[PDB]
Amino acid sequence: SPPVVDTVHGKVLGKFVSLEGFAQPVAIFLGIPFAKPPLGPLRFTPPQPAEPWSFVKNATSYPPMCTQDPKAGQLLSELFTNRKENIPLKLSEDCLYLNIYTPADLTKKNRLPVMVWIHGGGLMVGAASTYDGLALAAHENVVVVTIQYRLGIWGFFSTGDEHSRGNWGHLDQVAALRWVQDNIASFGGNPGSVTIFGESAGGESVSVLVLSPLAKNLFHRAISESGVALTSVLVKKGDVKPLAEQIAITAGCKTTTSAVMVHCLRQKTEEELLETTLKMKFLSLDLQGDPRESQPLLGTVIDGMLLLKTPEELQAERNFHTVPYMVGINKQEFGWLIPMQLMSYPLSEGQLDQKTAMSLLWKSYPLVCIAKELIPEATEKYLGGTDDTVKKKDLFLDLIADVMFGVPSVIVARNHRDAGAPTYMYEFQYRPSFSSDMKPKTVIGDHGDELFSVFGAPFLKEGASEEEIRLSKMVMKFWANFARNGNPNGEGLPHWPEYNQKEGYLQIGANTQAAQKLKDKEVAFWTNLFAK
Amino acid sequence: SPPVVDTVHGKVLGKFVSLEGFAQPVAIFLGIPFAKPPLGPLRFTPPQPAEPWSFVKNATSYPPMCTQDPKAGQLLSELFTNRKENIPLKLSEDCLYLNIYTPADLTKKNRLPVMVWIHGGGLMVGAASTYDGLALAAHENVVVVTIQYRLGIWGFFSTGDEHSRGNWGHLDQVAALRWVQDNIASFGGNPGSVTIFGESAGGESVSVLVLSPLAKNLFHRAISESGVALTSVLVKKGDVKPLAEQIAITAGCKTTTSAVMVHCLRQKTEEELLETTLKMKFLSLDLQGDPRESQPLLGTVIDGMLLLKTPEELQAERNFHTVPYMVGINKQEFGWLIPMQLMSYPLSEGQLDQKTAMSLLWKSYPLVCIAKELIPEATEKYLGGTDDTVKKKDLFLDLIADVMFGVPSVIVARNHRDAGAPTYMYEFQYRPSFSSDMKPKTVIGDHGDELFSVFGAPFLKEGASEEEIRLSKMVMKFWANFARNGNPNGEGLPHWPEYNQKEGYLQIGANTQAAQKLKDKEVAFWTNLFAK
Amino acid sequence: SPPVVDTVHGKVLGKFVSLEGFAQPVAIFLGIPFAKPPLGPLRFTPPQPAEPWSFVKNATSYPPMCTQDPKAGQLLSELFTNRKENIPLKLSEDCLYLNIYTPADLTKKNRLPVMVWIHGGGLMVGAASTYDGLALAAHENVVVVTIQYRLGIWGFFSTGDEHSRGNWGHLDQVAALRWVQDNIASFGGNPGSVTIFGESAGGESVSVLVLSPLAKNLFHRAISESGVALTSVLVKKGDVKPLAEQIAITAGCKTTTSAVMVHCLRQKTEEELLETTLKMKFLSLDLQGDPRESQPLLGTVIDGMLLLKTPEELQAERNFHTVPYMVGINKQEFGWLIPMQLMSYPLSEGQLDQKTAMSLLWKSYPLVCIAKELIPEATEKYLGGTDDTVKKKDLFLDLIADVMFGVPSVIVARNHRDAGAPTYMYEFQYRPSFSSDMKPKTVIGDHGDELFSVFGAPFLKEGASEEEIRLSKMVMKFWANFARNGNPNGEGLPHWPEYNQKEGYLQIGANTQAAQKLKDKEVAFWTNLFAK
Ligand SMILES: *[C@@H]1O[C@H](CO)[C@@H](O[C@@H]2O[C@H](CO)[C@@H](O[C@@H]3O[C@H](CO)[C@@H](O)[C@H](O)[C@@H]3O)[C@H](O)[C@H]2NC(C)=O)[C@H](O)[C@H]1NC(C)=O
């Protein structure tokens, strides 16, 4: 007796899964289309409503993930999946689907809080199917929705004008949120209480939706995990046309006009555009050439529809959605994963000098926009204290991590607090046992380590210790409490203080205690240095 | 002074033709477009209204026939044409046209009955231009409309969901009927009196329109000639996606998703799709491999728009148009044409044993859906009586013919009668002299033999005998009387009884007399056997 | 402080240029899109409104010219440009742009007359950017708009029916005029006073707009310079389909149906269509083959939307816009440019006999539609007076020029006068010093010589004499007076009489005086001869 739900566009057929320790099973719906496939002429256009179907659609198979680099996507899913076994996925330009995990009795009337997950991957890779919402939904009684969006060229190609504005992935996210508003009541969810949360590029997308006016009334709480829009690498500011012309030339198109480029790209096949994507070599640090010329990836643009101004100007004007907002970072954002596995840094030597540190900080211009004159001052600020190079390598990693994640997050939290909205901050400092054997094991709080506690990995995977299980339960309860109340606090949990003029935050880990003034001196130093 | 008619979309220039024995000439209009050409993006989509034209359109040339196998289409047109010479035709995806033959005085006010002809061909081949409506229109004072519709992949490709529902040819038929409703008053016809008649796949299409709700008020009488929707070979029930994926793989397309297949097939040229059609080898019995795997052709599906349920379920609920309905079969539906010429059967030996009969009945699974356990009982029922193999071959042909045409037609007539609508039945048993020299001359009432009497071949072709002329006159008068009155009976004609609890029918031939209980014992035996 | 103007679709950033002797600079806006790019499926379709843009558009770069033969386009721009240096241009199917030159103080309220320029080129070549409106706008305080339109196959391909009607360039011109009506008030112009003027194919375009009902209320004055719709070479009358099938076969497309041809051509790339254009060899006299078969170019057709009837029938019924109209010709329209540089005539010998004259007049059938029987009488009329073959070549050039330009212009002026609208005529007889060194210097009033006076070449280019400067000032003042008043006359100018039963006209040149009965005997002779 599988569950059957009746959405506006038709009826879907689900699947009951049972989690240990819970009598009620969770209804799971894999691959619900929230938008019309963006194929052919619809490429590089805003998403359109899905066409209604006539008979019950089977929703028990994982959808394809958006076309991307298969190796990088597979590696990212393996690294970030909370299920015991990694599920293979198929690439497709038809990828605008979402997965629903609802623990509600679909027979009765239920209004549960809805948490919508946005996956990371630098806006280039990633899949919604990587994350299983069975444990979180079962434990916390929330409806978990994991959405997909266009990536890479398909999602963020822009000519800088009205012919290809860009920001197609964020428009897909807005369309998915509208779908949730329209249909989540049939799955037991409460559309009047929707929380968006994401990690890395997902956190940047969450921040963008907080800034965007297109997303008004589509959510009520927000969580940013290791990502904000102030992160310079993802938000593309300046002249966007040189990158479009480079992409078009690589694809083999004429660059006479924006319309000509867009038309010629719309005629390309999926394989040709994926070959162009591989040729461009995104998400790879360029060891040779001028650092400022290299482009790490395609990303958000100030197109005039999704974002009217830059995030800095909008935050200055207080022109954003004033919802309860949670912003947090991991203790070592740049410890192992991003440098070694994701972008193949040359720091495998284990020793870093002052000269090599300055050279590598200049080579890292795309990630961190530091002018060459400011490089020596930063490198002396961080690496100057210690003489041994072993510690200096860790200090260089800390220097990169602060600029990329820590200062922007604290600045965004301060601006959100000043606008009068409730703000909460945390710093996750813990090393999951599910980590790769490649990690040196000196890394605690690597990028994405809080994902295994947010989605209840200890209950889906094997070999967790008791403290890890308790940490997962505590983090899931904090997230669900924030989703339903806009305030993470609850009974049986350590007190999480609100981020205010005291700047209190929570240090999440083996020992969970409150602290104050997160990244205060780092923020001060980098703010002074950049204004130089 | 050729006739000029002003349709809603513009004005058309016709042509006067004079038939012997009739003073008034017949106005003929060849190639009137009733819909927009289904080219490029419009492929695999419902038909759209035709764009209006500004100056008088010349309508004196036969239109192209829908793209199909040229050899098979030419052979079928030569076999079934009632004109003295066969007219060559050109393939095109732009084929949604119709031909009109009106004997009315276009100067005066005329409201003549309108007969709309749907051509056969297994939904894979055929053309409207094969049939000349000059003789019937001249003799009976009716407006004859011969329509074309999409065939093969173009007309009936389906993925089983909303991305490509299927039944494009049937929607073309509905569009042509709506065009008739809108425009047939300008040609002297009466839109309030419209009769649809067809043969083979045309009869199956007529039955489908009787069942479809999209066709409400578009016709008032119906004739089925050697074809109904209960004919299993044409209606595709089950899972439609494996056939779609086979077609896509043959065409060279990816099968990742329904939308992917549909988009990739829309990029193929006409030549590539016709090459795929020839590769698939439709309308050919597979002598090797599992019979149940082989697909004879693309056909009607239960897509939710044209047909909401299966014909059996719809007939059980009495959910169909209760118009006067004429259903008939030929005496030998499987005598020569279909097995020898159309499908190239191996039955040319002239001798058939019991073992070979059972083997061939199993090989014929696509045409007749007989489970292998039921094969021996079916073969002993027919072939068991006689010992000589010469008669056993004819009995095997009768076995195939009954299952394909006879039992389904009688069942449809019984259901229609029970629903309370007037039903009439006939069995045509005559051998036209215009038959091919290849026929053994022992076949009387071969498939499509009644066509030479329905469309007045004796008056267009050369060498007819007096009895053939009289039979053609009688059949044309019966058809016209049914069209204008819903009851074929008239003065000077043998009494044709209504199909009711007595089950009276007409035996049309050299001797025309009424009989009772057509195919009663065959229907009983095949109904009992299938429910086993 | 560049000028910024807010059009309906957005804001545009201009550029200030200063002309000697004028304190106020002229605001120049290069490349404003008035329509959506006609790319892909929009090829062979009426123009659609432009999509609005979000931020100020940069409008300081010349747009691309419509795809065409690059060599011929470059040569024509060099020959006809009034600027000191010829500006290179880039081909593109995205070419529906216009350039604005406004001398108004954009800060204040200004309502200046608007003069809209249509460029020539036989509807096959040409660009708007060739002509600089700085001098005219500065000298006369008028807003000058130079528009572009689709050319060649892209602009005038027609199948003769509703699938591809044709006249896409004329519809582009109508769209640009509507853009002017909507937006010219923001640039200081007066939409209630708009004048359209053109040359060669631009004059034929002006005449077509005068005759068309689609252009009602889009202009209030008109000027035709060496071109009218009565010119047979540009207006294609008869059966249009053979030319379409020739084009399709050259491009490699099927010719089964009009829809098939249009669809197959829409799939061709720009390069393939340009290769087809070069293969067809338009604008070249065919020295071999039947003259009547050769097609010089694609042009206007009676499609039923833009032109309901032929120009002769429309003029007979007086069914045209009765606005003040100026029609003029140059003294030697066929002297040097068109025969030698544009179409490569064989008249470089310098001697022309009677037999060779008759042969070349027969070969010239596409330009002049003279039946072979009328050739001897036409050739004896002109060439018969003089015995020396030196003068006979000039008389042959006069014969061609009269038929092509002079008789049609006087006939059109007479028809316009009879309908009751004000009419004015001129004959420009002067030799610019900016002419090519290739001219024999015996040519005075060559084709396009008045352009250097209309657009103020003496002030932009170098080396003009005093009389040339005075002539340019006089012509510019006459044109502006006609634009603002509908009557060229003013103070300090020679009296220009109105074309009436006296048939007065103005002989523009070094000596500017009024005359009467322009081309009376030529018109009489050619009218009698053709009606034979
Ligand atoms: C609108 O577009 C025009 C181009 O059509 C822009 O003018 C051009 O801008 C470029 C870059 O700003 C100029 O090149 C620059 O030259 C200076 C001096 O040599 C050099 O230092 C820079 O590194 C750069 O190479 C170019 O000269 C200028 N003019 C032309 C004719 O190209 C204009 O700035 C644009 N307006 C906007 C975007 O508001």
Side-chain angles (χ1 to χ4, degrees), chain C residues 80 199-201 225-227 330 332-338 405 443 445-451:
Chain C
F80 281 149
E199 198 262 2
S200 172
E225 310 182 29
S226 305
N330 287 4
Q332 307 177 17
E333 289 283 14
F334 216 74
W336 175 80
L337 190 132
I338 295 168
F405 303 96
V443 183
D446 197 11
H447 187 72
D449 272 9
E450 88 297 14
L451 294 172

PDB file of all heavy atoms in Angstrom, chain C residues 80 199-201 225-227 330 332-338 405 443 445-451:
ATOM      1  N   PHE C  80      29.686  55.626 -51.184  1.00  0.00           N
ATOM      2  CA  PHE C  80      28.574  56.472 -50.768  1.00  0.00           C
ATOM      3  C   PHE C  80      28.772  57.128 -49.407  1.00  0.00           C
ATOM      4  O   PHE C  80      27.893  57.875 -48.967  1.00  0.00           O
ATOM      5  CB  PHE C  80      27.273  55.662 -50.751  1.00  0.00           C
ATOM      6  CG  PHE C  80      26.653  55.448 -52.109  1.00  0.00           C
ATOM      7  CD1 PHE C  80      25.919  54.304 -52.365  1.00  0.00           C
ATOM      8  CD2 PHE C  80      26.784  56.385 -53.121  1.00  0.00           C
ATOM      9  CE1 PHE C  80      25.341  54.096 -53.600  1.00  0.00           C
ATOM     10  CE2 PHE C  80      26.208  56.177 -54.356  1.00  0.00           C
ATOM     11  CZ  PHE C  80      25.485  55.033 -54.594  1.00  0.00           C
ATOM     12  N   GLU C 199      17.341  56.646 -50.980  1.00  0.00           N
ATOM     13  CA  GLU C 199      17.990  56.720 -52.280  1.00  0.00           C
ATOM     14  C   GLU C 199      18.113  55.324 -52.873  1.00  0.00           C
ATOM     15  O   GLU C 199      18.419  54.362 -52.167  1.00  0.00           O
ATOM     16  CB  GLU C 199      19.375  57.378 -52.167  1.00  0.00           C
ATOM     17  CG  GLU C 199      19.953  57.880 -53.480  1.00  0.00           C
ATOM     18  CD  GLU C 199      20.928  56.911 -54.113  1.00  0.00           C
ATOM     19  OE1 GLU C 199      21.138  55.814 -53.560  1.00  0.00           O
ATOM     20  OE2 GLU C 199      21.491  57.252 -55.172  1.00  0.00           O
ATOM     21  N   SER C 200      17.871  55.227 -54.181  1.00  0.00           N
ATOM     22  CA  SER C 200      17.972  53.970 -54.930  1.00  0.00           C
ATOM     23  C   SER C 200      16.939  53.005 -54.359  1.00  0.00           C
ATOM     24  O   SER C 200      15.733  53.278 -54.491  1.00  0.00           O
ATOM     25  CB  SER C 200      19.422  53.485 -54.900  1.00  0.00           C
ATOM     26  OG  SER C 200      19.537  52.185 -55.450  1.00  0.00           O
ATOM     27  N   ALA C 201      17.335  51.882 -53.757  1.00  0.00           N
ATOM     28  CA  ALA C 201      16.360  50.999 -53.129  1.00  0.00           C
ATOM     29  C   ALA C 201      15.691  51.677 -51.942  1.00  0.00           C
ATOM     30  O   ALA C 201      14.583  51.301 -51.550  1.00  0.00           O
ATOM     31  CB  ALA C 201      17.031  49.699 -52.694  1.00  0.00           C
ATOM     32  N   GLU C 225      14.583  59.588 -53.959  1.00  0.00           N
ATOM     33  CA  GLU C 225      15.760  60.049 -54.678  1.00  0.00           C
ATOM     34  C   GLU C 225      16.279  58.910 -55.542  1.00  0.00           C
ATOM     35  O   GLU C 225      16.850  57.946 -55.024  1.00  0.00           O
ATOM     36  CB  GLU C 225      16.839  60.536 -53.707  1.00  0.00           C
ATOM     37  CG  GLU C 225      16.327  61.514 -52.662  1.00  0.00           C
ATOM     38  CD  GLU C 225      17.422  62.024 -51.752  1.00  0.00           C
ATOM     39  OE1 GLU C 225      18.583  62.095 -52.199  1.00  0.00           O
ATOM     40  OE2 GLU C 225      17.122  62.350 -50.587  1.00  0.00           O
ATOM     41  N   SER C 226      16.080  59.023 -56.854  1.00  0.00           N
ATOM     42  CA  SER C 226      16.530  58.012 -57.809  1.00  0.00           C
ATOM     43  C   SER C 226      15.941  56.639 -57.497  1.00  0.00           C
ATOM     44  O   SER C 226      16.653  55.634 -57.496  1.00  0.00           O
ATOM     45  CB  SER C 226      18.057  57.936 -57.848  1.00  0.00           C
ATOM     46  OG  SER C 226      18.622  59.202 -58.127  1.00  0.00           O
ATOM     47  N   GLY C 227      14.642  56.582 -57.226  1.00  0.00           N
ATOM     48  CA  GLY C 227      13.995  55.319 -56.942  1.00  0.00           C
ATOM     49  C   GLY C 227      12.519  55.463 -56.644  1.00  0.00           C
ATOM     50  O   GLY C 227      12.112  56.370 -55.915  1.00  0.00           O
ATOM     51  N   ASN C 330      18.838  62.077 -60.788  1.00  0.00           N
ATOM     52  CA  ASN C 330      20.080  62.698 -61.210  1.00  0.00           C
ATOM     53  C   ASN C 330      20.124  62.787 -62.730  1.00  0.00           C
ATOM     54  O   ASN C 330      19.433  62.052 -63.440  1.00  0.00           O
ATOM     55  CB  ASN C 330      21.281  61.911 -60.688  1.00  0.00           C
ATOM     56  CG  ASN C 330      21.494  62.090 -59.200  1.00  0.00           C
ATOM     57  OD1 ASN C 330      20.706  62.747 -58.523  1.00  0.00           O
ATOM     58  ND2 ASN C 330      22.560  61.501 -58.682  1.00  0.00           N
ATOM     59  N   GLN C 332      22.464  62.005 -64.920  1.00  0.00           N
ATOM     60  CA  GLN C 332      22.988  60.793 -65.546  1.00  0.00           C
ATOM     61  C   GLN C 332      22.949  59.664 -64.514  1.00  0.00           C
ATOM     62  O   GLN C 332      23.924  59.405 -63.811  1.00  0.00           O
ATOM     63  CB  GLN C 332      24.402  61.015 -66.077  1.00  0.00           C
ATOM     64  CG  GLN C 332      24.542  62.222 -66.989  1.00  0.00           C
ATOM     65  CD  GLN C 332      25.970  62.443 -67.445  1.00  0.00           C
ATOM     66  OE1 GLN C 332      26.807  61.548 -67.353  1.00  0.00           O
ATOM     67  NE2 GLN C 332      26.256  63.641 -67.938  1.00  0.00           N
ATOM     68  N   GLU C 333      21.811  58.974 -64.446  1.00  0.00           N
ATOM     69  CA  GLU C 333      21.642  57.921 -63.452  1.00  0.00           C
ATOM     70  C   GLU C 333      22.454  56.681 -63.802  1.00  0.00           C
ATOM     71  O   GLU C 333      22.841  55.914 -62.914  1.00  0.00           O
ATOM     72  CB  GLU C 333      20.163  57.566 -63.324  1.00  0.00           C
ATOM     73  CG  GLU C 333      19.328  58.633 -62.648  1.00  0.00           C
ATOM     74  CD  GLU C 333      19.507  58.644 -61.145  1.00  0.00           C
ATOM     75  OE1 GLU C 333      20.462  58.011 -60.655  1.00  0.00           O
ATOM     76  OE2 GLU C 333      18.690  59.282 -60.452  1.00  0.00           O
ATOM     77  N   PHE C 334      22.706  56.456 -65.089  1.00  0.00           N
ATOM     78  CA  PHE C 334      23.451  55.295 -65.553  1.00  0.00           C
ATOM     79  C   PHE C 334      24.794  55.680 -66.157  1.00  0.00           C
ATOM     80  O   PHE C 334      25.306  54.959 -67.018  1.00  0.00           O
ATOM     81  CB  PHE C 334      22.612  54.519 -66.571  1.00  0.00           C
ATOM     82  CG  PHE C 334      22.775  53.027 -66.492  1.00  0.00           C
ATOM     83  CD1 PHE C 334      22.210  52.307 -65.452  1.00  0.00           C
ATOM     84  CD2 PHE C 334      23.468  52.341 -67.473  1.00  0.00           C
ATOM     85  CE1 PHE C 334      22.351  50.934 -65.388  1.00  0.00           C
ATOM     86  CE2 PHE C 334      23.610  50.970 -67.410  1.00  0.00           C
ATOM     87  CZ  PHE C 334      23.052  50.268 -66.366  1.00  0.00           C
ATOM     88  N   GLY C 335      25.377  56.795 -65.717  1.00  0.00           N
ATOM     89  CA  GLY C 335      26.609  57.268 -66.324  1.00  0.00           C
ATOM     90  C   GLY C 335      27.784  56.342 -66.077  1.00  0.00           C
ATOM     91  O   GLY C 335      28.341  55.769 -67.017  1.00  0.00           O
ATOM     92  N   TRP C 336      28.190  56.199 -64.817  1.00  0.00           N
ATOM     93  CA  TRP C 336      29.379  55.420 -64.494  1.00  0.00           C
ATOM     94  C   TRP C 336      29.144  54.355 -63.427  1.00  0.00           C
ATOM     95  O   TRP C 336      29.459  53.182 -63.639  1.00  0.00           O
ATOM     96  CB  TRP C 336      30.489  56.367 -64.044  1.00  0.00           C
ATOM     97  CG  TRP C 336      31.717  55.673 -63.586  1.00  0.00           C
ATOM     98  CD1 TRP C 336      32.703  55.151 -64.366  1.00  0.00           C
ATOM     99  CD2 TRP C 336      32.100  55.423 -62.232  1.00  0.00           C
ATOM    100  NE1 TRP C 336      33.676  54.588 -63.582  1.00  0.00           N
ATOM    101  CE2 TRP C 336      33.328  54.741 -62.266  1.00  0.00           C
ATOM    102  CE3 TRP C 336      31.519  55.707 -60.993  1.00  0.00           C
ATOM    103  CZ2 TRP C 336      33.990  54.342 -61.110  1.00  0.00           C
ATOM    104  CZ3 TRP C 336      32.174  55.311 -59.849  1.00  0.00           C
ATOM    105  CH2 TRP C 336      33.398  54.636 -59.913  1.00  0.00           C
ATOM    106  N   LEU C 337      28.580  54.747 -62.283  1.00  0.00           N
ATOM    107  CA  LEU C 337      28.624  53.886 -61.104  1.00  0.00           C
ATOM    108  C   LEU C 337      27.925  52.556 -61.354  1.00  0.00           C
ATOM    109  O   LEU C 337      28.557  51.494 -61.313  1.00  0.00           O
ATOM    110  CB  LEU C 337      27.995  54.609 -59.910  1.00  0.00           C
ATOM    111  CG  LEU C 337      28.173  53.935 -58.546  1.00  0.00           C
ATOM    112  CD1 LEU C 337      28.633  54.940 -57.509  1.00  0.00           C
ATOM    113  CD2 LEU C 337      26.889  53.266 -58.091  1.00  0.00           C
ATOM    114  N   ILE C 338      26.620  52.594 -61.624  1.00  0.00           N
ATOM    115  CA  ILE C 338      25.850  51.354 -61.735  1.00  0.00           C
ATOM    116  C   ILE C 338      26.409  50.427 -62.806  1.00  0.00           C
ATOM    117  O   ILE C 338      26.637  49.244 -62.508  1.00  0.00           O
ATOM    118  CB  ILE C 338      24.363  51.677 -61.966  1.00  0.00           C
ATOM    119  CG1 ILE C 338      23.772  52.394 -60.750  1.00  0.00           C
ATOM    120  CG2 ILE C 338      23.598  50.401 -62.257  1.00  0.00           C
ATOM    121  CD1 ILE C 338      22.400  52.992 -60.990  1.00  0.00           C
ATOM    122  N   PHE C 405      14.840  55.034 -64.225  1.00  0.00           N
ATOM    123  CA  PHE C 405      14.594  56.038 -63.196  1.00  0.00           C
ATOM    124  C   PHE C 405      13.651  57.147 -63.635  1.00  0.00           C
ATOM    125  O   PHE C 405      12.749  57.517 -62.876  1.00  0.00           O
ATOM    126  CB  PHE C 405      15.930  56.654 -62.749  1.00  0.00           C
ATOM    127  CG  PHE C 405      16.923  55.646 -62.253  1.00  0.00           C
ATOM    128  CD1 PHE C 405      17.900  55.146 -63.095  1.00  0.00           C
ATOM    129  CD2 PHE C 405      16.884  55.201 -60.944  1.00  0.00           C
ATOM    130  CE1 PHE C 405      18.815  54.221 -62.644  1.00  0.00           C
ATOM    131  CE2 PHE C 405      17.796  54.274 -60.489  1.00  0.00           C
ATOM    132  CZ  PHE C 405      18.762  53.785 -61.340  1.00  0.00           C
ATOM    133  N   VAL C 443      31.160  62.785 -66.580  1.00  0.00           N
ATOM    134  CA  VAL C 443      29.883  62.468 -65.953  1.00  0.00           C
ATOM    135  C   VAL C 443      29.516  63.561 -64.958  1.00  0.00           C
ATOM    136  O   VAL C 443      30.265  63.848 -64.015  1.00  0.00           O
ATOM    137  CB  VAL C 443      29.958  61.095 -65.264  1.00  0.00           C
ATOM    138  CG1 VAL C 443      28.614  60.721 -64.660  1.00  0.00           C
ATOM    139  CG2 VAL C 443      30.414  60.024 -66.245  1.00  0.00           C
ATOM    140  N   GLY C 445      26.242  64.475 -62.563  1.00  0.00           N
ATOM    141  CA  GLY C 445      24.977  63.950 -62.078  1.00  0.00           C
ATOM    142  C   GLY C 445      24.922  62.440 -62.094  1.00  0.00           C
ATOM    143  O   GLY C 445      23.906  61.863 -62.493  1.00  0.00           O
ATOM    144  N   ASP C 446      25.999  61.785 -61.674  1.00  0.00           N
ATOM    145  CA  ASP C 446      26.013  60.333 -61.616  1.00  0.00           C
ATOM    146  C   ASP C 446      25.094  59.843 -60.501  1.00  0.00           C
ATOM    147  O   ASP C 446      24.651  60.608 -59.642  1.00  0.00           O
ATOM    148  CB  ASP C 446      27.436  59.818 -61.394  1.00  0.00           C
ATOM    149  CG  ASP C 446      27.583  58.347 -61.723  1.00  0.00           C
ATOM    150  OD1 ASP C 446      26.653  57.774 -62.325  1.00  0.00           O
ATOM    151  OD2 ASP C 446      28.627  57.761 -61.376  1.00  0.00           O
ATOM    152  N   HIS C 447      24.800  58.548 -60.528  1.00  0.00           N
ATOM    153  CA  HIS C 447      23.947  57.965 -59.506  1.00  0.00           C
ATOM    154  C   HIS C 447      24.550  58.184 -58.125  1.00  0.00           C
ATOM    155  O   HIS C 447      25.723  57.886 -57.885  1.00  0.00           O
ATOM    156  CB  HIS C 447      23.760  56.472 -59.767  1.00  0.00           C
ATOM    157  CG  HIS C 447      22.761  55.820 -58.865  1.00  0.00           C
ATOM    158  ND1 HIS C 447      21.405  56.033 -58.979  1.00  0.00           N
ATOM    159  CD2 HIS C 447      22.921  54.952 -57.840  1.00  0.00           C
ATOM    160  CE1 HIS C 447      20.772  55.328 -58.058  1.00  0.00           C
ATOM    161  NE2 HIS C 447      21.669  54.663 -57.354  1.00  0.00           N
ATOM    162  N   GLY C 448      23.738  58.708 -57.210  1.00  0.00           N
ATOM    163  CA  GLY C 448      24.171  58.952 -55.852  1.00  0.00           C
ATOM    164  C   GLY C 448      25.007  60.194 -55.653  1.00  0.00           C
ATOM    165  O   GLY C 448      25.633  60.334 -54.595  1.00  0.00           O
ATOM    166  N   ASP C 449      25.049  61.100 -56.630  1.00  0.00           N
ATOM    167  CA  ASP C 449      25.855  62.307 -56.478  1.00  0.00           C
ATOM    168  C   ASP C 449      25.195  63.303 -55.532  1.00  0.00           C
ATOM    169  O   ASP C 449      25.886  64.072 -54.856  1.00  0.00           O
ATOM    170  CB  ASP C 449      26.107  62.946 -57.842  1.00  0.00           C
ATOM    171  CG  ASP C 449      27.342  62.393 -58.525  1.00  0.00           C
ATOM    172  OD1 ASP C 449      27.914  61.403 -58.026  1.00  0.00           O
ATOM    173  OD2 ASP C 449      27.751  62.956 -59.561  1.00  0.00           O
ATOM    174  N   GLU C 450      23.861  63.307 -55.465  1.00  0.00           N
ATOM    175  CA  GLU C 450      23.177  64.241 -54.580  1.00  0.00           C
ATOM    176  C   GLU C 450      23.405  63.909 -53.111  1.00  0.00           C
ATOM    177  O   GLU C 450      23.170  64.765 -52.252  1.00  0.00           O
ATOM    178  CB  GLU C 450      21.676  64.270 -54.899  1.00  0.00           C
ATOM    179  CG  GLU C 450      20.807  63.236 -54.180  1.00  0.00           C
ATOM    180  CD  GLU C 450      21.159  61.806 -54.531  1.00  0.00           C
ATOM    181  OE1 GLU C 450      22.231  61.578 -55.124  1.00  0.00           O
ATOM    182  OE2 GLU C 450      20.359  60.905 -54.212  1.00  0.00           O
ATOM    183  N   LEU C 451      23.868  62.694 -52.806  1.00  0.00           N
ATOM    184  CA  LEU C 451      24.070  62.296 -51.418  1.00  0.00           C
ATOM    185  C   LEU C 451      25.123  63.160 -50.738  1.00  0.00           C
ATOM    186  O   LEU C 451      24.986  63.506 -49.559  1.00  0.00           O
ATOM    187  CB  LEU C 451      24.473  60.822 -51.350  1.00  0.00           C
ATOM    188  CG  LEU C 451      23.436  59.786 -51.789  1.00  0.00           C
ATOM    189  CD1 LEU C 451      24.065  58.411 -51.841  1.00  0.00           C
ATOM    190  CD2 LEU C 451      22.241  59.780 -50.855  1.00  0.00           C
TER     191      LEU C 451
END
